[PDB]
Design a protein around this ligand. Sequence first.
Ligand SMILES: CC[C@@H](C)c1nccs1
Length: 157
Amino acid sequence: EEASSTGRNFNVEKINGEWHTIILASDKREKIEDNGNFRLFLEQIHVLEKSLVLKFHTVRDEECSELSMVADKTEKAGEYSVTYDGFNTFTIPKTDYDNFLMAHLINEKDGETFQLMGLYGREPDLSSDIKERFAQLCEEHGILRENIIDLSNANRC
Ligand SMILES: CC[C@@H](C)c1nccs1
């Protein structure tokens, strides 16, 4: 089907369940690198009436730890907010529900802002074609390929 979170035909309900982080991209690469606070490996989304429960794991020297966050709907169509290392708002520009999900997040902290984009899959990896589509969307947002990190071979635990 394919829909947008800000789109009218969006069914947030259909994003419920298992996901995997496939690719992260950012305006500020350090945020997603080895020691970055936003290098998060999504495991599950639980869709509630006015919020999303997000379950992640993070990696630190092959040592995994769990992290959970609750994101609230804002007043903008298809947008959610969550406090984590600053204030974040995110939307879901594209998803087909049963295979991939593309997210766009804006973080604000200490007078600075950065953008993060993520490609998530129902399976541990996605086709190279979908990965290229993601790169194209990143380009549209001013994120170059040198700032796109494929984490598929690290999205284990
Ligand atoms: C799908 C996961 C996106 C939306 C995340 N939310 C808070 C940090 S990244």
